């Protein structure tokens, strides 16, 4: 038994500076990541009522916290994110398959979810691309399980993730919080030459996963010149996002009826071409 | 030597009773199908000067001809794909390699354009998915070559491409008529009942590819049941788009400038939602 609709939930994120209609934001590449695995999307708003946030989980089938600049303490991107990862949770220890993804900040949104607290340092790594240095626990895997063999051992030796992050957390900080060992098999490190970080990870017991790196952006972001645009890169978004859709897929929610449904979905907004000013070919904007 | 921000152009076809901004129409599942293997879109106007869809050949990496139920023979999007037909034929012969796709109508364009004759039959088509009778010459095909081997009997197994044409041409006629027999390679088959038909081809001297099939649909529409959605037809419409756009790779062409490139991008336009109804989630419309 199985989901072969699945819709996937996408969090929204606060504008630096809001006005009406700029409250959130999402950059319209994490919705073509998922897309293009076979979901459809909901925007998830950001300044909600615990209950319509529950109602909205209820109702959808997986949901990507993705990466930014914004507080990881007192934004509203944090507080709904706080907010799905506990029901998440709870969802699942009750049989109720529900996975949940975080890219860049929401992997970082994750560490501090998980641990209760803070631990990030400064790294090299605000643009450059990179392969995964994998661990030995990566043969164990869930997320690369379905990867060809030859992708794998190009994400090894190819530059083909893309790093854009001021913040990480190194192995040490995270070797050495007992919360964080035990709840995230690490799947892959890197390092900007000094500190060595934590960039791919699953939890342990929980449909949970997170990368310090943007996989949507292989294919769907041409604005930079450190994101990686060769045919193994793209590759890697691909599989990548037909993971976690795959994961979807074995969640049963769905919505109340489906006039909801139509009124929740991305089709119903219009995105902005901001891609001569940010690093986001369009991105919606929300009130 | 190969190009790694390969753009596609996209024709806009006839809009049955048109108005202003309401004279062609391009369904978005077409631009995501090709964003999503690392392509740029370009949509293609509809009643324009041939020195100008010159201007576009010469500055884009490839073409698509989206399907649709619109004039063969004096629809303004005929017009316009005969000439980029013309135009990457003669490219090719002079060594500027140029990839051109067709999909449903436009693979029934293609016959056409290649054999200079109208040779189609109705066939019950219209909503119904289907494997693909693999052909002997799929074998050593060139569209094929990169999909995996477990991918390739799911497709002759498996109800993964979705069909909605009123039109094909039987093996038969196809048979039966030299130019085509000789140009193209049958890598496809299908039946209806007691029609039988080519489904998928490619060219023996030249990168030209169609099919009677309509790949895009699996991952990015959700509009009507016969579109398949299992995550090999998920997939399957991946592995189309890559396909093509590494044929793409291989052009070098670009445009006279970036603000050129800019003003000529689908990041200009904004789709309208229109799934409540038609058999499309979002489709864009052009003056």
Redesign the interface.
């Given at each position: 038994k199985t989901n072969?609709?699945p819709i996937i939930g996408v969090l929204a994120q606060d504008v630096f500076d809001p006005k009406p209609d700029r409250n959130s934001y999402i950059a319209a590449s994490y919705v073509?990541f998922l897309?293009?695995?076979?979901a459809?999307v909901v925007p998830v708003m950001i300044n909600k009522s615990e209950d319509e946030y529950s109602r909205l989980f209820k109702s959808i089938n997986g949901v990507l916290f993705p990466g930014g600049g914004v507080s990881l303490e007192s934004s509203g991107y944090s507080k709904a994110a706080g907010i799905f990862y506990r029901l998440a949770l709870e969802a699942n220890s009750n049989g109720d398959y529900f996975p949940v993804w975080g890219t860049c900040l929401g992997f970082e949104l994750l560490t501090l979810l998980t641990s209760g607290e803070l631990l990030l340092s400064h790294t090299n790594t605000s643009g450059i691309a990179l392969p995964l240095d994998f661990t030995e626990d990566v043969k164990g895997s869930r997320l690369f399980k379905e990867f060809?063999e030859e992708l794998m051992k190009s994400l090894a030796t190819e530059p083909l993730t893309e790093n854009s992050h001021q913040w990480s957390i190194t192995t040490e900080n995270f070797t050495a919080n007992k919360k964080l060992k035990k709840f995230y098999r690490v799947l892959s490190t890197n390092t900007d030459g000094y500190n060595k970080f934590v960039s791919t990870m699953e939890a342990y017991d929980f449909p949970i996963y997170a990368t310090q790196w943007n996989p949507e952006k292989?294919?769907?972001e041409?604005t930079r010149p450190y994101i990686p645009?060769?045919?193994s890169?793209?590759?890697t978004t691909?599989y990548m996002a037909?993971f976690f859709?795959?994961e979807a897929?074995k969640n049963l929610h769905s919505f109340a009826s489906t006039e909801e449904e139509?009124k929740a979905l991305i089709?119903?907004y219009?995105?902005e071409?901001t891609?001569?000013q940010s690093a986001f070919?369009?991105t919606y904007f929300f009130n």
């Open positions: 072969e609709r073509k897309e293009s695995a076979g459809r060809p292989n294919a769907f041409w645009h060769t045919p890169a793209i590759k691909f037909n859709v795959n897929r139509e089709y119903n219009k995105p071409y891609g001569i070919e369009q």
